[PDB]
Amino acid sequence: DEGHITNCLHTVRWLHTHNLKYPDARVSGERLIINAPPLIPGVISSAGLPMRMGWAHDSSDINLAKLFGT
């Protein structure tokens, strides 16, 4: 089903490393993809963690995004 897979391929455009909408769903615009900052000895942060991505956009997609973003 090229249509089902096409709808799934489209979700890739909004995979991100950092989520600009987290505290408030009203924020509108582009995604953010950045490598973790250099480690600071006195601070707990993403600097000590491996690279991972997530997904946010329409409520409807949830299932269709799972093929490539898992």
Instruction: Specify which residues 32 forms β-bridges with.
Output: 18
Whole-number Å distance between alpha carbons of 62 and 60: 6
- Rank residues 39 and 62 by Cβ distance to DNA and give the closer one: 62
Angle at the Cα of 15 (from 9 to 19), degrees rounded to 5? 155
Minimum CB separation from DNA for residue 59, in Å?
Answer: 3
Interacting residues with DNA (CB under 7 A): 59-60, 62-63
- Cβ closer to DNA: 24 or 42? 24
Please, what is the minimum distance in Å from the beta carbon of residue 50 to DNA? 25
